[PDB]
Amino acid sequence: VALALRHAILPKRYGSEYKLHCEWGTYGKPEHFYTDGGKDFRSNHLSQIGAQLGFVCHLRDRPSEGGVVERPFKTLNDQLFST
DNA sequence: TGACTGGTTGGCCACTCAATTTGCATCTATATAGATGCGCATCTATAT
Numbered sequence: 001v002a003l004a005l006r007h008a009i010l011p012k013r014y015g016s017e018y019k020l021h022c023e024w025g026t027y028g029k030p031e032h033f034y035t036d037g038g039k040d041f042r043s044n045h046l047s048q049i050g051a052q053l054g055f056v057c058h059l060r061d062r063p064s065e066g067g068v069v070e071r072p073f074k075t076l077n078d079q080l081f082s083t
Numbered sequence: 084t085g086a087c088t089g090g091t092t093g094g095c096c097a098c099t100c101a102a103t104t105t106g107c108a109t110c111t112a113t114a115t116a117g118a119t120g121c122g123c124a125t126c127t128a129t130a131t
Binding site for chain 2 (some may be wrong): 036
C-alpha cells in the first residue's frame, strides 16, 4: 500500500520503452483514503502515513460500496488480460 | 771473786605534669542483595 501511495502521489514519468503517446499526468495527495477492512489498510503503518500526510482513513461498509475500485478489475479482465 | 745495787746524754604530706589506657562518638569507603525497565521470542486473534 505504501509503494502504491508513493506512485500515486509523486509526479509520474516513463521512458520510450513504454511507447506511450499520452502522459499519465496525475499527482498530489488525498484528503481522505477509503478502503476495505483488510489488515493492510487497518495497519499502524498506514495510520502513521495518514497522520504525516494528513489524510484520515475510512473503512467501507460493504464490498458493494467500493464500486469505484471494485469495477475496474472487471474492466481490466475484459479489455486487457483475457487477450 | 762473781753476785748484788747504783749511774748517766631525708622524712611526711600537698600539689603538678607528661603519659598512656580506655572508652565513646563520628565519619567513610566499600560489599552486597532486591526493584525496575527494555528487548526480543511466542502464542492468540482477525482480516482479505
